[PDB]
């Protein structure tokens, strides 16, 4: 199957498969069962920010999620992406709902990747920044219920005419061009991703979350990967 590496912003606690007893941030490596997690004070209704960093020197994947003027949550895990992911991958955002729902709105997204081989200043770089999403975003691959153009935002999961979120929905958005994430002869390789989101929920508890992920190029939404699976995993192993 696909090869996933993701940083999830889990809004619902499915303790029946690993989730801590509260909304959390986590690092997933080929499994929905996070290798490491951190408590997160989700704030239904307002805009938050997520910063994700990784470099080949420390080989440590770290994430920060915060809300303006509130406290921020941090999670880190040591991992050598070199022997987890293929040298060429695709990056994207995923989200889903199920029994409970929430909106999974992306207001902006930027990505930067740099690879310098042992030849020195021989640096290869890729950078894209989205602050506005048009109705026809040809540089994005939309899967599932994902749509763009509404208010200039990217809505990952189904949203009604008035803006009410819907249950049992999944959708992703991957950047069109393949990304060279690591090279055999690379002195330094690093990348950083950032995106602002807006999770609003009408019912009791919002669910199920958003996640930044890296995968094999031809990756696609697994069947039934709605709900607790965040549109990333076929099962919960």
């Amino acid at each position: 199957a696909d090869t996933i590496v993701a940083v999830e912003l889990d809004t619902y606690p499915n303790t029946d498969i690993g989730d801590p007893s509260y909304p959390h941030i986590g690092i997933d490596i080929k499994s929905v069962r996070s290798k490491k997690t951190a408590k997160w004070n989700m704030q239904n209704g307002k805009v938050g920010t997520a910063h994700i960093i990784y470099n080949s020197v420390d080989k440590r994947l770290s994430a920060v999620v915060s809300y303006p003027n509130a406290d921020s949550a941090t999670v880190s895990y040591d991992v050598d992406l070199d022997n987890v992911l293929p040298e060429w991958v695709r990056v994207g955002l995923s989200a889903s709902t199920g029994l409970y729902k929430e909106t999974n709105t992306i207001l902006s997204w930027s990505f930067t990747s740099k690879l310098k081989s042992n030849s020195t200043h021989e640096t290869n770089a890729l950078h894209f920044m989205f602050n506005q999403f048009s109705k026809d975003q040809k540089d994005l691959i939309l899967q599932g219920d994902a749509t763009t153009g509404t208010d200039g935002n990217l809505e990952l999961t189904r949203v009604s005419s008035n803006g009410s979120p819907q249950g049992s929905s999944v959708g992703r958005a991957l950047f069109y061009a393949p990304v060279h994430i690591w090279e055999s002869s690379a002195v330094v390789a690093s990348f950083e991703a950032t995106f602002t989101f807006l999770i609003k929920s009408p019912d009791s508890h919002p669910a199920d979350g958003i996640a930044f992920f890296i995968s094999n190029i031809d990756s696609s939404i697994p069947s039934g990967s709605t709900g607790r699976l965040l549109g990333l995993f076929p099962d919960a192993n």
Binding site: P23, W40, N41, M42, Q43, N44, G45, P68, A70, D71
Partner: peptide
């Protein structure tokens, strides 16, 4: 008043 649900933690501010 509007809200942050079943929220979690400590000292924070973005109403």
């Amino acid at each position: 008043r509007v809200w942050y649900p079943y929220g979690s933690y400590l000292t924070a501010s973005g109403s």
